[PDB]
Design a protein. Structure first.
Lengths: 127, 100, 46, 41, 176, 143, 77
C-alpha cells in the first residue's frame, strides 16, 4: 500500500475516495515510517500544521506516540491528546537541540541574545 | 495550547524572516523552537507584560533590519576597564564610515 | 546597565542606516497586523 | 550556586595562567601586570 | 623645521607655500571621510563631555591628525628635492606624536571664540524662608544651571575643532 | 545677590575647567596640541596591551604539542571574552575541555598501544563517555 | 647576529611595526639568552660569578629600557 500512497501523494490529496480507502488500510496495517510519510504527504494539500508536525516527528523517526495514525484520519481538527503530544515533542526537540549547540559552542547562547538586543529601545536593554 | 495558532505564527516567521542565519545546518522547525526557548528563558519579564509572539516578531524584525544575513554583535560596558579596552580596540572609523 | 553594541558583518556588506530601520520595521509590523489583529506592535516600536 | 561556578571560573583561569607561566618568565609577568595596573589607574 | 617654516622663508614665499598647503588641506577636508569624522565628532559631544576617556568617534578624528600633519609637511615642502618622504612612509608612536604636535586646522574660525551666555536667574521669594529659598536655588542649579553651563562649555570646546565648510568659507570671503 | 553671583562665578570657572579636562583632545587650543597627543598615546598603550596578549598566545601556540593547541585556544578564548559574558557556562566550557581530553586520549590509543583487549575496552568506554551513538549496554554486553 | 631561540620568539610576534611595541617584549626576547651549562659544582660557581659580573657590568653600563644595543629588535626581525 506504500506505493499506492506515494502515487496518490503526487496526485490531488485529501479529497478522494480510493485514496481515503488506501489511507484507512495503511492505518489498519500500522506501518512504521511509510504510514507517517503518507500522512505527511496527503495532509500537505489540506492545511499544513498536522502534516508538518508529522514530518518533523518522523524526521527523528519516533515510533512512539502513535496517536497520529488515528488523528490524521479525517483530520478536520486536532484532539487535545494530539495537541499535547505535538507540543511535548516540540518542547523536547527545542530543549535537546538547544543543549547540543551549547555543548558544541559554549558561546551560542551569548551570541543569539546579543544578536537580538542591539536594535531595541532602553526598555529591553535594562531588562 | 492552540497548536495551529503556534504553527501559523511559525509559518509567518519563516515566511518573512530568513531564520537560517541564526542557526545553520538545521530545519526551520528546530530553529523556530530553539529561538522560542531562548526568548522564554531570557524575556519572561516582558512576557508578563507584552505578548510572546509580539515580542518575538519585534526582536526578529529588528535583528534582520540590522542586516538580512549574518551579523556579529559584541557588547561592551564602557564604565569597565577591560570592556572599554575591547571597545576602543575593535572599533574602527574606516569600518564605521563604510557602514561595516 | 548601559552597554554599547558594535555590529559588524562577516560578509563585509554594508549595514543600513537608522532611517532604513524605521522603514524596514513597519513593513513587517503591517505584515503581522494583517496576519493577526489586536496586537500592539506600534507601541512597542515607539 | 554563585560559589561553585565562581570556583570553576577561577580554576579555568588558573589553568590558563599556569599555561602562560610555563612559557614565560617572572620579570615579564611583573612588567605586564605593572603596566596594566598603571593603565587602570 | 616645519614649526618655524616662516622664519626661514620670506613673506611672499611663505604666502605661496602656505597657500598651497591650506588649499590642499581644504580640498582634502571636503572628502566624505573627513566630513563623516567631524559629523561623528559632533554627534557624541554630550556623551563624551561626561568623561576624560575618549570614544570611538573621538578616536576617529584623532587618527587622522598624524596623516594630516604628514600631508601638511609634504604639501609645504613639495618643492624641496632634498626632502625624503620615505621616512614619513612608516613612523613609530613617538614620531607620530611629534608629527601630531605640529597640526593646525586652517578651516577653523581664526578669530576669538570667547562669548557671553546669559542664564536666567531665579529671584528669591519673600514668602519663602532662607532654607526653602536655598533648597529651591540648589534644585534650580542642579537641574537647569549646571546642565546649561555644561552644554555651553562643551559647545565651546567642540566648536574649536569642527571646521567651516567650503560654502561658509566662500560666503565669509575667506577662500577663493 | 552678591553671594549668588560669586558662587556662580566659581561654578562657571569650575565647569569651564571640567569641560577643558574632558574635551582637551578635540581642539588645538592648547599650545603644541599636547593633551590630544596624550589621549592618543593612551589608545596606543591600550592597543599595544591587547596585541601583547595575543602575541603571547602565538608564542605558546608554537611551543605546545600539536595535540594541545585546540585546548589552549579554548582556554585562551575563555580568558579573553568567555569569563566576562554571563551567558557563557563555565560548566559547559569544562565539559568541552573534558570531551577534548577524551578525544586526545583516544588518539593516544592509536599510538601502537598493542593491547589486545584494552584497545576494545578503552574504545568502547570513550565512545560511551562522550555520549556517541554507541550504547552503554553495547559495551556492557561486550564485556 | 641572532640565534634560533630569539628568531622563534620574534617570528611568533606579529603585527608589530614600531620599536616601542617590540621594546614592550624586552623580557620575552631576553629569554633567548639561554646558557647550556652543566649543574656541576664548578659550573654553578662559574654561573654565580658570571651573573654577579653581569650585574656589576650592567650597573656600569646603565642603559635605559628603550636603548638596548644587545637585545635584538626590529632591524634583525
Ligand atoms: C590586593 C589588591 C589587588 C589589586 C589587583 C587586582 C584588582 C585590581 O585592582 O584590578 C585592576 C585591574 C582590573 O582589570 P581587569 O582586566 O578588568 O581585571 C582583571 C582581574 O583583576 C584579574 O587580574 P588578572 O588575572 O589579569 O591578573 C592579576 C591578578 C593575578 O592573580 C590571579 O589571577 C589570581 C587568580 C586566582 C588564583 C588561584 C585560583 C584557585 C583559587 C582557589 C580558592 C580556594 C582555596 C584553595 C586555594 C588557597 C590558596 C591560598 O592579581 C590579582 O587578582 C590580585 C589578587 C591576587 C590574590 C587574591 C586571589 C583570590 C582568589 C580567590 C580566593 C577564594 C578563597 C575562598 C573564598 O587589573 C589589573 O590591573 C591587573 C594587574 C594588577 C596588579 C596588582 C599589583 C599589586 C597591587 C597594587 C595595588 C596595591
Ligand atoms: C645569559 C643569562 C643571563 C641573562 C641576563 C639578562 C639579559 O639577557 O641581559 C641582557 C643585557 C642586554 O643589555 P642592553 O642591551 O644594554 O639593554 C639594557 C636595557 O636597560 C635592558 O637591560 P635589563 O635590565 O632588561 O637586562 C640586564 C640584566 C642584567 O642583570 C643581571 O644579569 C642580573 C643578575 C643578578 C645575579 C645575582 C647578583 C648578586 C650579586 C650582585 C653584586 O637585568 C636583568 O636581568 C634584570 C635586573 C636584575 C634582576 C635580578 C636582581 C637580583 O645584557 C647583555 O646582553 C649582556 C651584556 C654584557 C656586557 C657588554 C657591555 C658592557 C658595558 C660596556 C660599556 C657600554 C657599551 C655600550 C655599547 C653601545 C654600542 C653597541
Amino acid at each position: 500500500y506504500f506505493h499506492s500512497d506515494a502515487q496518490i501523494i503526487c496526485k490531488p490529496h485529501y479529497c478522494i475516495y480510493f485514496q481515503d480507502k488506501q489511507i484507512t488500510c495503511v492505518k489498519m496495517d500500522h506501518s512504521i515510517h511509510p504510514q507517517i510519510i503518507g500522512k505527511d504527504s496527503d495532509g500537505i494539500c489540506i492545511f499544513q500544521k498536522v502534516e508538518k508536525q508529522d514530518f518533523y516527528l518522523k524526521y527523528r523517526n519516533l515510533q512512539l506516540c502513535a496517536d497520529q495514525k488515528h488523528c490524521y484520519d479525517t483530520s478536520q481538527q486536532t484532539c487535545m491528546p494530539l495537541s499535547a503530544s505535538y507540543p511535548a515533542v516540540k518542547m523536547g526537540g527545542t530543549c535537546g537541540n538547544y543543549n547540543e549547540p551549547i555543548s558544541i559552542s559554549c558561546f551560542y547562547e551569548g551570541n543569539v541574545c546579543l544578536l537580538e538586543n542591539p536594535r531595541v529601545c532602553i526598555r529591553i536593554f535594562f531588562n | 495550547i492552540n497548536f495551529k495558532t503556534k504553527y501559523r505564527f511559525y509559518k509567518f516567521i519563516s515566511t518573512n524572516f530568513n531564520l537560517q542565519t541564526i542557526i545553520k545546518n538545521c530545519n526551520d522547525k528546530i530553529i523556530f523552537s530553539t529561538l522560542l526557548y531562548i526568548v522564554n528563558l531570557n524575556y519572561s519579564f516582558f512576557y508578563k507584560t507584552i505578548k510572546n509572539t509580539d515580542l518575538i516578531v519585534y526582536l526578529l524584525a529588528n535583528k534582520f533590519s540590522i542586516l538580512n544575513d549574518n551579523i556579529i554583535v559584541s557588547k561592551f560596558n564602557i564604565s569597565k576597564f577591560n570592556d572599554y579596552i575591547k571597545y576602543i580596540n575593535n572599533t574602527n572609523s574606516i569600518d564605521t564610515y563604510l557602514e561595516n | 546597565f548601559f552597554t554599547d553594541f558594535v555590529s559588524l558583518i562577516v560578509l563585509g556588506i554594508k549595514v543600513i542606516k537608522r532611517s532604513n530601520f524605521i522603514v524596514y520595521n513597519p513593513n513587517h509590523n503591517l505584515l503581522t497586523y494583517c496576519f493577526n489583529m489586536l496586537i500592539f506592535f506600534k507601541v512597542n516600536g515607539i | 550556586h554563585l560559589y561553585t561556578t565562581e570556583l570553576l571560573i577561577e580554576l579555568i583561569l588558573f589553568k590558563y595562567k599556569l599555561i602562560i607561566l610555563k612559557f614565560s618568565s617572572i620579570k615579564y609577568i611583573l612588567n605586564f601586570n605593572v603596566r596594566k595596573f598603571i593603565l587602570f589607574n | 623645521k616645519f614649526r618655524y617654516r616662516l622664519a626661514n622663508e620670506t613673506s611672499e614665499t611663505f604666502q605661496r607655500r602656505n597657500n598651497r598647503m591650506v588649499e590642499r588641506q581644504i580640498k582634502r577636508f571636503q572628502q566624505p571621510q573627513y566630513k563623516h569624522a567631524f559629523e561623528q565628532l559632533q554627534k557624541n559631544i554630550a556623551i563624551s563631555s561626561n568623561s576624560g576617556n575618549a570614544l570611538h568617534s573621538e578616536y576617529g578624528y584623532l587618527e587622522l591628525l598624524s596623516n594630516e600633519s604628514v600631508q601638511l609637511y609634504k604639501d609645504y615642502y613639495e618643492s624641496d628635492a632634498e626632502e625624503d618622504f620615505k621616512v614619513f612612509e612608516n613612523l613609530s608612536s613617538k614620531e607620530k606624536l611629534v608629527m601630531i604636535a605640529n597640526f593646525e586646522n586652517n578651516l577653523l574660525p581664526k578669530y576669538d571664540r570667547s562669548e557671553v551666555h546669559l542664564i536666567p536667574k531665579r529671584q528669591w521669594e519673600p514668602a519663602f524662608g532662607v532654607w526653602e529659598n536655598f533648597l529651591y536655588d540648589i534644585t534650580e542649579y542642579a537641574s537647569f544651571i549646571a546642565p546649561r553651563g555644561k552644554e555651553i562649555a562643551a559647545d565651546y570646546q567642540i566648536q574649536s575643532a569642527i571646521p567651516l565648510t567650503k560654502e561658509e568659507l566662500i560666503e565669509a570671503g575667506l577662500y577663493k | 545677590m552678591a553671594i549668588r553671583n560669586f558662587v556662580f562665578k566659581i561654578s562657571n570657572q569650575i565647569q569651564n575647567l571640567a569641560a577643558k579636562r574632558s574635551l582637551a583632545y578635540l581642539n588645538q587650543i592648547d599650545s603644541q596640541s599636547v593633551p590630544s597627543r596624550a589621549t592618543i598615546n593612551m589608545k596606543d598603550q591600550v592597543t599595544q596591551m591587547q596585541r601583547e596578549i595575543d602575541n603571547m598566545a602565538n608564542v605558546i601556540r608554537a611551543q605546545i604539542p600539536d595535540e594541545d593547541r585546540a585546548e589552549f585556544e579554548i582556554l585562551k578564548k575563555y580568558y579573553v571574552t568567555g569569563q566576562h559574558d554571563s551567558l557563557v557556562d563555565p560548566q559547559d566550557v569544562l565539559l568541552q575541555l573534558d570531551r577534548i581530553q577524551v578525544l586526545k586520549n583516544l588518539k593516544m590509543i592509536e599510538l601502537n598501544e598493542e593491547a589486545y583487549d584494552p584497545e576494545l575496552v578503552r574504545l568502547e568506554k570513550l565512545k560511551a563517555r562522550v555520549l556517541l551513538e554507541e550504547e552503554g549496554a553495547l559495551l556492557e554486553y561486550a564485556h | 647576529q641572532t640565534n634560533k631561540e630569539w628568531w622563534n620568539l620574534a617570528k611568533n610576534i606579529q603585527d608589530v611595526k614600531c620599536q616601542q611595541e617590540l621594546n614592550r617584549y624586552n623580557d620575552l626576547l631576553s629569554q633567548a639568552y639561554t646558557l647550556s651549562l652543566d649543574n656541576t659544582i664548578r659550573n654553578l660557581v662559574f654561573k654565580a660569578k658570571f651573573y654577579s659580573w653581569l650585574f656589576v657590568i650592567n650597573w656600569f653600563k646603565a642603559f635605559p629600557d628603550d636603548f638596548h644595543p644587545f637585545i635584538p629588535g626590529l632591524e634583525m626581525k
